[PDB]
Design an enzyme around this catalytic site. Structure first.
Site, PDB file in Angstrom:
ATOM      1  N   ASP A 181       2.226  -2.130  -7.099  1.00 35.57           N
ATOM      2  CA  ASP A 181       1.654  -2.390  -5.791  1.00 35.57           C
ATOM      3  C   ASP A 181       0.708  -1.265  -5.387  1.00 35.57           C
ATOM      4  O   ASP A 181      -0.354  -1.405  -4.680  1.00 35.57           O
ATOM      5  CB  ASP A 181       2.870  -2.338  -4.852  1.00 35.57           C
ATOM      6  CG  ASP A 181       2.859  -3.229  -3.729  1.00 35.57           C
ATOM      7  OD1 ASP A 181       1.942  -4.052  -3.587  1.00 35.57           O
ATOM      8  OD2 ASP A 181       3.865  -3.268  -2.937  1.00 35.57           O
ATOM      9  N   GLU A 230      19.908   1.403  -5.049  1.00 35.54           N
ATOM     10  CA  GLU A 230      18.603   1.743  -4.571  1.00 35.54           C
ATOM     11  C   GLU A 230      18.219   3.265  -4.810  1.00 35.54           C
ATOM     12  O   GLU A 230      17.101   3.598  -5.345  1.00 35.54           O
ATOM     13  CB  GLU A 230      18.390   1.417  -3.065  1.00 35.54           C
ATOM     14  CG  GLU A 230      18.143  -0.024  -2.674  1.00 35.54           C
ATOM     15  CD  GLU A 230      17.083  -0.866  -3.361  1.00 35.54           C
ATOM     16  OE1 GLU A 230      16.132  -0.129  -3.868  1.00 35.54           O
ATOM     17  OE2 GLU A 230      17.037  -2.067  -3.531  1.00 35.54           O
ATOM     18  N   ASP A 242       8.538   3.467  -2.627  1.00 37.99           N
ATOM     19  CA  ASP A 242       9.818   3.276  -1.894  1.00 37.99           C
ATOM     20  C   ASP A 242      10.481   4.674  -1.709  1.00 37.99           C
ATOM     21  O   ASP A 242      10.518   5.493  -2.656  1.00 37.99           O
ATOM     22  CB  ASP A 242      10.739   2.270  -2.570  1.00 37.99           C
ATOM     23  CG  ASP A 242      10.178   0.897  -2.736  1.00 37.99           C
ATOM     24  OD1 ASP A 242       9.436   0.375  -1.957  1.00 37.99           O
ATOM     25  OD2 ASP A 242      10.444   0.315  -3.815  1.00 37.99           O
ATOM     26  N   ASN A 277       5.440   1.497  -6.779  1.00 42.16           N
ATOM     27  CA  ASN A 277       5.407   0.062  -7.213  1.00 42.16           C
ATOM     28  C   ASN A 277       4.136  -0.157  -8.027  1.00 42.16           C
ATOM     29  O   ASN A 277       3.408   0.876  -8.046  1.00 42.16           O
ATOM     30  CB  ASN A 277       5.579  -0.757  -5.924  1.00 42.16           C
ATOM     31  CG  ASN A 277       6.998  -0.511  -5.448  1.00 42.16           C
ATOM     32  OD1 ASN A 277       7.190   0.036  -4.358  1.00 42.16           O
ATOM     33  ND2 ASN A 277       7.911  -0.883  -6.324  1.00 42.16           N
ATOM     34  N   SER A 296       2.366   0.952  -3.932  1.00 44.21           N
ATOM     35  CA  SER A 296       3.260   1.162  -2.786  1.00 44.21           C
ATOM     36  C   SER A 296       4.302   2.170  -3.429  1.00 44.21           C
ATOM     37  O   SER A 296       4.261   2.358  -4.629  1.00 44.21           O
ATOM     38  CB  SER A 296       3.793   0.015  -2.085  1.00 44.21           C
ATOM     39  OG  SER A 296       4.746  -0.893  -2.562  1.00 44.21           O
ATOM     40  N   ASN A 324      10.195   0.615   1.536  1.00 42.21           N
ATOM     41  CA  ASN A 324       8.851   0.337   0.988  1.00 42.21           C
ATOM     42  C   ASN A 324       7.770   0.973   1.955  1.00 42.21           C
ATOM     43  O   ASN A 324       7.969   0.932   3.145  1.00 42.21           O
ATOM     44  CB  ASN A 324       8.516  -1.094   0.718  1.00 42.21           C
ATOM     45  CG  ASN A 324       7.394  -1.378  -0.238  1.00 42.21           C
ATOM     46  OD1 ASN A 324       6.843  -2.540  -0.271  1.00 42.21           O
ATOM     47  ND2 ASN A 324       7.002  -0.467  -1.107  1.00 42.21           N
TER      48      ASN A 324
END
Length: 129
Positions: free
Chosen positions: A48, A35, A52, A46, A50, A59
């Site tokens: 998205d 990660e 992380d 993302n 979004s 997220n």
């Protein structure tokens, strides 16, 4: 901060992540491996729109607040950037909420994908236990 394998297990442990919702350090260390490549400052956008954050790559869609994810929730009550610290308390405490959220470590895609069902203990090997 780029953690060591063994000096990541450790913080994880003093931070109550060790066998949380039944997931051993091994899980949590491998999970942080893939990660963030154990770096607390890994942020990733993302499609998205979004992003992380940190260590366990939280997220911004439901878990933390950063200011630009139109839809999002802040289910962990914390600024997204508090996930980027040298001290893992936020992201651990966040972690705890997520894994508690029904679907287990599966909420972490690289975990399902790269660590799930693998010799995860290998991750905490030699680590002063």
């Amino acid at each position: 901060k780029v953690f060591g394998r063994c000096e990541l297990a450790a913080a994880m442990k003093r931070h109550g992540l060790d066998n949380y919702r039944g997931y051993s350090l091994g899980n949590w260390v491998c999970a942080a491996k893939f990660e963030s490549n154990f770096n607390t400052q890994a942020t990733n956008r993302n499609t998205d729109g979004s992003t992380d954050y940190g260590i366990l790559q939280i997220n911004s869609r439901w878990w933390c607040n950063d200011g630009r994810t139109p839809g999002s929730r802040n289910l962990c009550n914390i600024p997204c950037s508090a996930l980027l610290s040298s001290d893992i308390t936020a992201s651990v405490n966040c972690a705890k909420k997520i894994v508690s959220d029904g679907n287990g470590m599966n909420a972490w895609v690289a975990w399902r994908n790269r660590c799930k069902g693998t010799d995860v203990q290998a991750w905490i090997r030699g680590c002063r236990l």
